[PDB]
Amino acid sequence: EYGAIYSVSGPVVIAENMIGCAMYELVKVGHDNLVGEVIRIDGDKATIQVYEETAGLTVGDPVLRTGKPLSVELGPGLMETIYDGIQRPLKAIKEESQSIYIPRGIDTPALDRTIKWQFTPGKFQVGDHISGGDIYGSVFENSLISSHKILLPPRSRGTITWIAPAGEYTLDEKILEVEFDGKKSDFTLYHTWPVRVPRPVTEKLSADYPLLTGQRVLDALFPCVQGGTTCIPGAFGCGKTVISQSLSKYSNSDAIIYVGCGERGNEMAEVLMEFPELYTEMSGTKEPIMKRTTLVANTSNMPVAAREASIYTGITLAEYFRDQGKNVSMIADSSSRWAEALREISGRLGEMPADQGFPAYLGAKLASFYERAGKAVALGSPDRTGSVSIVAAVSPAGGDFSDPVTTATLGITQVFWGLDKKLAQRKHFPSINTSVSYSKYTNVLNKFYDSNYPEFPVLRDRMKEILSNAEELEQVVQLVGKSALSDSDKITLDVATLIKEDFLQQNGYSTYDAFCPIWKTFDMMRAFISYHDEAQKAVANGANWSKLADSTGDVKHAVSSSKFFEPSRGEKEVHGEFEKLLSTMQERFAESTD
Amino acid sequence: LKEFEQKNAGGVGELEKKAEAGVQGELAEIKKIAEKKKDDVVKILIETVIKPSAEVHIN
Amino acid sequence: FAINKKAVEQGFNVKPRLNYNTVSGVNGPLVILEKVKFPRYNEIVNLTLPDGTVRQGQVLEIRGDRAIVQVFEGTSGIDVKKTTVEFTGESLRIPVSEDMLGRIFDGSGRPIDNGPKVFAEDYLDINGSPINPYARIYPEEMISTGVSAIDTMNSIARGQKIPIFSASGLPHNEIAAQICRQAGLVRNFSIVFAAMGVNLETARFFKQDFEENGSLERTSLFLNLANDPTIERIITPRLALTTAEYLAYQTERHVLTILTDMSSYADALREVSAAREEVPGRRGYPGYMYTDLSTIYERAGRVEGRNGSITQIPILTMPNDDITHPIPDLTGYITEGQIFVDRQLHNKGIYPPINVLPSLSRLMKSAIGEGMTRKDHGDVSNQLYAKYAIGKDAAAMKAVVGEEALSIEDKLSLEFLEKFEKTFITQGAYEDRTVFESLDQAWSLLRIYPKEMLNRISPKILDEFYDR
């Protein structure tokens, strides 16, 4: 249709003479042909979202509808690329522009047509019945992700009436003649899909095979499993990005996606150009890790709707990859910024919130957006098994109970890592409050540990109980200081102190403090358990703690330096050292005790 | 200190000569360039004044 | 070059302007017209009161033959019969040049110092266009200031947003003046400062500081006091940022910017948010000023193409000694780092009365350490922060419990604190401390402790300088 602009209000426009449209549908508007999606319609006046800047626009300007909702392009060339929130090639736009600005109305394609690829037909013979989700051939995209699978987009059935031969090809080429009713089934190497609607799947499954971060507190204490999610506060002194980097370089992820909404620009440019400096620490040294990474970085300065749609775009890409039966991870800049954008948009629309500045549906929208993650078995004959994991970097408003978004998250998630402000005040990073965080998966994940460390759970549980008791007795001692107190009191105090300075402290940048394996954590835990238990049973019959520690001397220090055990040094050399440490500790306790 | 105060008054005639040096050359060259492009720009502006620009806003 | 000669040709086609005379309504800072053809959203228009006086404004809302126009230069004496409205048909164009050095500019950006027009090399849009995200470089060459606290605990690398969270009735402006005049880059500079919603004495003070500094020739100001119409206060920062961009990213010069007041900016935005109804956000504020703040802070940093860089230092006033208040909270969301001051220290006669605990520079790791400084700096800062917090909480605890649960280290940390505030924080208004002697004093204070408490120091560094 050819509409006329009736009224303009900043990031809002009212057209006239609009008839027969869908309230979620792309539109080309104005002489510059900007991009906008209708939102609210009535009669012939359309309330249209504008995803760009408005300046000098006048009434009566032509308005061009599209007839389809917002979608993204899927296929090859996605990986190791950077786009805006609305899927626009930052690098291509920059190089074409040959400037340092972004023109208005540019339409650089999402996936370039300037690169050919070496396709290979699958095993589907012409004349066979086909359906969505069935691989019919693969192409090579990159070494780490070689054999990019090619699938029939859902809602697509028929009989293969032809197959394209192998060889080098680019996009835009029909490669599969199929017929549902007529030859019309023509498909090139890529395709598209609306962002709002998640793609289907055969079914879902349980969770197991815990994720790994390299940092002791998270994996050891509050387990994290792929096919799941959690909220991680960002303090900028608690390793804002160190956790993300460790995840990228250690998490056994087939693909990595990080998005940027509240990007201050400094962090944006840095992370962007320090990814090149990063290297793949997996299956040999591959200098580029970006082969597993694709980024959607968007600063606040872009239109709000872009920051709104960023997460939908990212999660859609995640689902597209996992459909190939892979493991994916998501990183979010700051969900609080996304919520702020949501409330801004709602207010601009002109409907009252109900949560001191947030529309009620926010909870439902967050729940729906979250619910795309998990583990599932793919759809189609090839029978893939995908898994989507994510993490939301919650950025508080300087408070905890002030922002309902916290409640919304805590009401839906199943693993949540809090934050102790005082730890940051002491620069005690990693700064995490133990008493608040929690992880429900520990229950199920016994069925996994029992295969590797069948004694880990109870040991961890007793350690956590000891930590809780120390926390409790602190509130009593502080008000009265030292008094008539049993040797067990000092035992608890010192063991808690050692645990926290060992566990809850570690340099974010060191070969022995920025990364740990499971077995090494197991050894640390067992050593501390043995230390405390032997000390307590010794003091059980006399053995004043002063002379006890003197007799054992520096056993606490003897184990303290164990952190300096460099991992990756054989796993038997380190394990042998830990066995020697346990032997000396047990014998020393047995002897000095008497 | 009295000597320094006196010398603070010694810089009263250098200022005028420095100003004259700073100005005179730029003044002269501005006056000179006021003639080369003079007629050229005169013609350009005069001719550009009379141009018609028939147009209609269509929307 | 020649392509530059081949682009100005557009400045030779002239088209008259429509002059409407159909004023339909006036409500304070807003005027409503009727029977308007082709509104052309975001237009600059001029008005003539029925006395010869001329003022101007911009349109904000448009529909069928109805346009809503704000105006800056007051609203008195407006009649609905004898006023004329003309349409320039364009958004705001700011003349630009190199000669503006040593020029005083009103809130509207005009020579208020007896100087003629700027003889512009071009007219620019106050609203530029976004920088491509894939076009920025990360700040480095940590610039110093001679201020122990700033230079040591919250050092700043040029190219970063750095709010100065000031409180009412504090010498924040003097702190900024000392910073700029004593600006030191050891691993010159153009300074443009905008004065908006400010009193008078500060203006003369800053002019005096620049004249005595002698750097007045390498700076220009945009002045906008309270008697000036409040509405235009939403414009001055745009002018400042446009000028800074022009100078930096076209002359490749390192430039620093100072903004006196964001509070007045938020006040003006709220002011013109109610003459027209708007679903208010927290404390009456329309929720979308987050966007405008991002727009203001969009301009900063460095890019590969241009050597010149820009650094922002907006002075912000806490309304009631508060951070969760919408202004400071929103600024913290998107800004970088922060500089904090407290009334207690000032009451204690301590200059500068900085409050370290809240003040944190989000970005310090990149532009520190070896190559330009000594790697000890990080551990020094961490240990100082930790011991300071420990001493503060120990004093607080004693204030309610007395000397009945005070470990020896508690009172050690106390006395350490008293000496720390007394000596380290205190500085003369004319002495600059390089990072070197700063760290030397840091180690002097530190060496009161044993080699076991200071766990925030690496054994290597813990042993290098514990005794020299």
Print the SS3 string covering A232-257.
CCCCCCCCCCHHHHHHHHHCCCCEEE
Distance from CA of A2 to the nearest CA of B (A): 11
User: How many angstroms away from the CA of A59 is the closest CA of chain B?
Assistant: 7
* Residue contact C38–B53, C-beta within 8 A: no
Determine the Cα–Cα distance for residues A363 and A464; give it in Å rounded to an integer.
Answer: 33
Which of A172, A187, A202 is where one domain is finished? Answer: A187
Helix (H), strand (E) at residue A304? helix A304-322
Same domain, A104 and A174: no
Instruction: Provide the domain count of chain A.
Output: 4
Of A439, A456, A478, the residue that ends a domain is A439
Q: From CA C179, how far away is CA C174, in angstroms rounded?
A: 8
A220 and A174, same structural domain? no
Report the residue count for chain A. Answer: 594
- State how far residue A325 is from chain C, nearest Cα, in angstroms: 32
Instruction: Tell me whether strands A385-388 and A327-331 are parallel, antiparallel or unpaired.
Output: parallel
Distance CA C14, CA C308 (A): 36
Size of interface A-C (CB pairs under 8 A): 174
How far is it, in rounded angstroms, from Cα C406 to Cα C325? 37
Residue recorded with tokens 């809240």: C358
User: If you write DSSP's letter for every residue of A528-552 in order, what string do you get?
Assistant: HHHHHHHHHHHHTSS--HHHHHHHH
C-alpha to C-alpha distance for C147 and A543, rounded to whole angstroms: 55
Sign of the alpha-carbon torsion through A16, A19, A25, A28: negative
Q: How far is CA C214 from CA C37, C58, C209, C255, in A?
A: 53, 39, 8, 17
Q: How far is CA A69 from CA A21, A155, A239, C359, in A?
A: 11, 16, 39, 46
Do A227 and A370 have their domain in common? yes
Same domain, yes or no: A265 and A364? yes
Q: Are residues A205 and A101 in the same domain?
A: yes
At residue A53, φ and ψ (nearest 5 deg) are: -90, 150
Per-residue CA distances from A154 to A26, A201, A352, A382 (Å): 22, 10, 39, 14
**For residue C329, which residues of chain A lie inside 8 Å, CB to CB?**
397-398
CB < 8 Å to A84, chain C = 133
- Cα-Cα-Cα-Cα torsion A81, A82, A88, A90, nearest 10 degrees, comes to -110
CA A233 to each of CA A249, A352, C155, C326: distance values in angstroms, whole numbers, following the listed order = 21, 29, 25, 21
d(CA C139, CA A264): 13
How many angstroms separate the first and last alpha carbons of chain C? 60
Residue that has been written with the tokens 């089934």 in this structure: A185
Q: Are A236 and C335 in contact (CB under 8 A)?
A: no
Characterise C114 by phi-psi region: left (phi > 0), alpha (psi -120 to 50), beta (else).
left
Start-to-end CA span in chain B (Å): 80
Q: Please tell me the distance in Å from B55's CA to the nearest CA on chain C.
A: 10
Tell me whether strands C136-137 and A203-204 are parallel, antiparallel or unpaired: unpaired
Chain B partners within 8 Å of A59 (Cβ): 59
Residue A196 and residue A143 in one domain: no
Q: Within chain B, how many helices (H) and strands (E) appear?
A: 2, 0
Q: What are the start-end ranges of the H helices in A353-486?
A: 362-370, 404-412, 421-425, 446-452, 456-480
Strand order in the sheet with C255-259: C104-105, C219-225, C190-198, C255-259, C310-318, C164-167, C339-340
Same domain, A296 and A357: yes
**Of A391, A393, A395, nearest to A415 (Cα)?**
A391
Place of tokens 């339409």: A107
- Compute the distance between CA of residue C260 and CA of residue A430 in angstroms, rounded to an integer: 37
Q: DSSP letters along C292-354, please?
A: HHHHHHTS-BEESS----EEEEEEEEESSS-SSSHHHHHHHHHS---EEB-HHHHHTT-SS-B
In this structure, the answer to whether residues A451 and A320 fall within a common structural domain is no
Nearest to A528 by CA among A501, A489, A566, A568: A501
Spatial neighbors of C239 by CB under 8 A, at least 6 apart, are: C94, C105, C109, C126, C194, C222
Burial of A161 (0-12, 13-18, 19+ CB in 10 A): middle
Contacts of C13 in chain B (CB under 8 A): 48, 51, 53
Residue position matching structure tokens 């300046």 = A55
Report in angstroms the alpha-carbon separations of C202 from A405, A453, C209, C318: 43, 69, 10, 18
> In what side-by-side order are the strands of the sheet with A167-169?
A148-151, A135-139, A117-121, A167-169
**CB contact at 8 A, A35 and A28:** yes
The residue of chain A with its CA nearest to that of C398 is A479
Element (H, E) at C410: helix C408-419
Residue positions forming the annotated binding site of C for ATP: 362
Asked if B51 lies within 8 A of C15 by C-beta distance, the reply is: no
Cα atoms in the Cβ-side hemisphere of radius 13 Å centred on A563: 20
Task: Please give the C-alpha separations between residue A287 and each of A91, A173, A276, A278, in angstroms, as whole numbers.
Answer: 20, 34, 8, 7
**Breaks in chain A after residues, C-to-N cutoff 2.5 Å:** none
Cis peptide before C352 (omega within 30 of 0): yes
Residue A103: C-alpha distances to residues A28, A37, A117, C282 (Å): 16, 20, 30, 35
Are the C-beta atoms of A405 and A335 separated by less than 8 Å? yes
Written as one string, the DSSP assignment of C128-169 is --PBPGGGEE---SEEB-S-HHHHHHS-EESSSB--EEEETT
Is residue A568 left, alpha or beta, with left meaning phi > 0 and alpha meaning psi from -120 to 50?
left
User: Closest chain A residue to C44 measured between Cα atoms?
Assistant: A56
Is residue A3 within 8 A of residue A15, CB to CB? The reply is yes
The answer to whether residues A563 and A556 touch, using CB atoms and an 8 Å cutoff, is no
DSSP conformation class of A510: S
* Contact between residue C411 and residue C398 where contact means Cβ atoms under 8 Å apart: no
Same domain, A259 and A124: no
Rounded-to-integer distance, Cα C195 and Cα C193, Å = 7
In this structure, the answer to whether residues A194 and A263 fall within a common structural domain is yes
Q: Judge whether A296 and A257 are in contact, CB under 8 Å.
A: yes
Q: How many CA atoms lie within 13 A of A182 on its CB side?
A: 2
Instruction: Give Cβ neighbours of residue C183 (< 8 Å, ≥ 6 apart).
Output: C143, C145, C189, C256
- Asked if the Cβ–Cβ distance from B48 to C14 is below 8 Å, we say yes
End-to-end CA distance of chain A: 94
**Structural resolution in Å:** 6.6
Give B-chain residues touching C9 at CB under 8 angstroms: none
Technique that determined the structure? cryo-EM
Residue to substitute from C12, C18, C40, C87, interface B, most B β-carbons within 10 A = C12
Partner-chain residue, chosen from A100, A347, A427, that has the shortest CB–CB distance to C456: A427
Question: Please, which residues have CB within 8 angstroms of residue A226's CB and are 6 or more apart in sequence?
Answer: A207, A209, A210, A211, A327, A329, A375, A387, A389
Among residues A384, A80, A514, A91, the alpha carbon closest in space to that of A257 is found at A80
Same domain, A410 and A521: no
Dig out the tokens for C262 from the structure: 């964001």
| A4 contacts chain B (CB < 8 A) | yes
Query: How far apart are alpha carbons C332 and A398 in whole angstroms?
Result: 10
For residues A588 and A476, membership in a common domain is answered with: yes
Cα–Cα–Cα angle for C403, C404, C406, nearest 5°?
65
CA distance A546 to chain C (A): 18
CA dihedral of A80, A152, A172, A70, whole degrees rounded to 10: -70
Range of the domain at A20: 2-70
Q: Would you tell me which residues 36-55 of chain B have a C-beta closer than 8 angstroms to some C-beta of chain C?
A: 44, 48-49, 51, 53, 55
A560: helix, coil or strand? Answer: helix
Residue A179 · residue A158 · CB < 8 Å: yes
Q: How far is the C-alpha of A24 from the C-alpha of C458, rounded, in Å? A: 58
Among A135, A161, A187, identify where a domain stops.
Answer: A187
d(CA A260, CA A90): 13
